[PDB]
Amino acid sequence: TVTKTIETHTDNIETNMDENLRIPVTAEVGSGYFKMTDVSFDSDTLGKIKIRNGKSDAQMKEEDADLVITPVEGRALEVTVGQNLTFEGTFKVWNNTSRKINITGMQMVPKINPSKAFVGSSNTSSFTPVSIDEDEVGTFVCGTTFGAPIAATAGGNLFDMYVHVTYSGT
Amino acid sequence: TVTKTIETHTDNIETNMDENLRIPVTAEVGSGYFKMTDVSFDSDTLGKIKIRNGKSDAQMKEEDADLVITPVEGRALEVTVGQNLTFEGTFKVWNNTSRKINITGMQMVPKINPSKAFVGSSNTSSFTPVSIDEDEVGTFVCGTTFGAPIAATAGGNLFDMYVHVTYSGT
Amino acid sequence: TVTKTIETHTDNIETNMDENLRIPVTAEVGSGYFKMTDVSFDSDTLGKIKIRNGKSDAQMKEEDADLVITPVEGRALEVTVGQNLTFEGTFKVWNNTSRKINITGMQMVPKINPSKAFVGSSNTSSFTPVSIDEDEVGTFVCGTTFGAPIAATAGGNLFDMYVHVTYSGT
């Protein structure tokens, strides 16, 4: 039956939806946090995505988007703020999609500055994968530890956080 | 012809099957190896996957699964065991699937412990991609070198090994 | 309508085309550049790919391939050549495909030598994502900074550069 084959394809195509979301972030010196700016964009794979600071779970659901991302300053990562070695990028996301979504990876890339330089010290990130069911809000704990203190000088605290999102699931 | 278009879609959907398999591992202090625990799970993309320690190639094929993963302690990586800086995660896999599969990437992520901390020293992994034909067994040599000695203290030897698996192929 | 559903599937399957291109490279000591060798290969996802050194944009378009990759020695990355700590792998690509393509990631993997060893010092890469429209030529600036000087000894300057290519797009 072509009808059931097409239905199968629909499901398989959905399971094949992959995406490395790029979120520009700022390691705010003395805060232990990676800050992200409110933005709205469209992904050919994930649809409408909106980053919204300071939203409670309920407020997130009022947003018109497929996915809403809200950073959380809950200190899910232990850090000595004054050292400026480890920064937390933890955020929660509301899955306003018809299928369970999975956040399973993160990489912190130093931004190349106008002088064509970038912070090249050791860069080691960690995170806790999370699967979020339809309409639910889940938290993706993540962060990065650098081999040398982060400073705002020469755009040294600017990064692009890439988060791997997938509808596959295990 | 719709018939041939559907056949084309079937092939293309198959080629688009991507997956980052998460395998929890323990860097066993003084062994130079990342140890994995026998487990059985289902991937929306790859199907039934089973990790089975101590299996010979023949034994792997007796397992009821789409893919069988078996770690190999063959010292495919040169290491001075007492230093606890480099650990090998080499494993072989039986492809019980209808298409050549490719293992082309690996990343070792430090596990965040209950105290909300994680090993943040330099973390550099290496591996040798391998393509495995239908019913064949192939070995994926891989390992990681850390900037500081690994210790079991505070869950410092616990990691999540992510292996990139794809049906694309080059 | 099955006709329009199939058309939708065609578009979605296309958007799901993902690929981690493996390009063997040599960090040429004293040059500040990752060198790649002319090669021609086929990707189940991306099609015919050809790496061609020294080609001008016009010359790239004369090549018979879906994608043409040409390294660019334009010092898009600031480096002190004699230190051998930072190497640039910047390259441009001609998109001879029917859809806008995106180059959004890069990882530099140390090659395991015959003696079963690999350079395990800190390894931190950076890059600037680029989207390339049909028939256009775009440049993907990228590079890596190592924790210790790179040397050709024991194949210590050999790597496999993995570049993430996707038709998704944001």
Q: How far apart are CA A67 and CA A80, in angstroms?
A: 32
Sequence ranges of the domains in chain C: 17-170
- Asked if residue C108 lies in contact with residue B68, where contact means CB atoms within 8 angstroms, the answer is no
Instruction: Give chain B's largest Cα–Cα span.
Output: 65
Contact pairs from chain A to chain C, CB under 8 Å: 81
Which of C140, C160, C39, C127 lies closest to C95, judged by CA? Answer: C140
Report CA-CA distances (Å) from B69 to A168, B53, B140. Answer: 20, 8, 10
Amino acid at A31: S
CA angle, A13 then A19 then A24, to 5°:
160
Method: X-ray
Question: What string of H, E and C letters represents the secondary structure of C27-39?
Answer: EECCCCEEEECCE
Which of B22, B25, C14, B165 lies closest to A169, judged by CA? Answer: B22
Instruction: Give chain C's largest Cα–Cα span.
Output: 65
φ/ψ region of A112 (left if φ > 0, alpha if ψ in -120 to 50, else beta) reads beta
Q: Give Rg (Cα) of chain A.
A: 18
Q: Which tokens is B92 given?
A: 């072989």
- Asked if residue A62 lies in contact with residue A101, where contact means CB atoms within 8 angstroms, the answer is no
Contacting chains of A (3 CB pairs or more, <8 Å) are B, C
The CA distance from A44 to the nearest CA of chain B, in Å, is: 15
Contacting chains of B (3 CB pairs or more, <8 Å) are A, C
**At which residue do the structure tokens 């190497």 appear?**
C87
Q: What is the dihedral of CA B113, B119, B123, B128, to 10 degrees?
A: -30
Strand A91-95 versus strand A137-140 pairing type: antiparallel
Q: Does domain B17-170 match CATH 2.60.40.2770?
A: yes
Secondary structure of residue A89 in the 3-state scheme:
coil
Read off the DSSP letter of residue C112: P
The CA distance from B169 to the nearest CA of chain C, in Å, is: 6
Q: How far apart are CA B12 and CA B21, in angstroms?
A: 21
Nearest CA in chain C to B100: C44
Interface test with A, best of B44, B50, B69 (most A CBs within 10 A): B44
Contact B16/C13, CB-based, under 8 Å?
Answer: yes
Q: What is the secondary structure of chain B as a DSSP string? A: -HHHHHHHHHHHHHHT-EEEEEEEEEEETTTTEEEE--EEEEETTTEEEEE-TT--HHHHTTS-SSEEEEE--S--S---GGG--EEE--EEEEE-SSS-EEEEEEEEEEPP-TTS----S-EEEEE--EEE-TT-EEEE-EEEEESS---SGGGTTEEEEEEEEES---
Interface test with B, best of A5, A7, A8, A12 (most B CBs within 10 A): A12
Instruction: For chain C, say whether A9 makes contact (Cβ under 8 Å).
Output: yes
Contact C110/B128, CB-based, under 8 Å?
Answer: no
Instruction: For chain A, say whether B117 makes contact (Cβ under 8 Å).
Output: yes
Which of B47, B141, B23 lies closest to B98, judged by CA? Answer: B47
Nominal resolution (angstroms): 2.0
Q: What is the dihedral of CA B52, B57, B59, B62, to 10 degrees?
A: 90
Q: What is the secondary structure of C70-111 as a DSSP string? A: EE--S--S---GGG--EEE--EEEEE-SSS-EEEEEEEEEEP
Contact C112/B77, CB-based, under 8 Å?
Answer: yes
- Asked if residue C144 lies in contact with residue C160, where contact means CB atoms within 8 angstroms, the answer is no
Which of C135, C139, C162 lies closest to C18, judged by CA? Answer: C162
Looking at the partner chain, which of A13, A78, A104 has a beta carbon nearest the beta carbon of B20? A104
The CA distance from A62 to the nearest CA of chain B, in Å, is: 31
Residues 6+ apart with CB under 8 A from B28: B34, B35, B87, B157
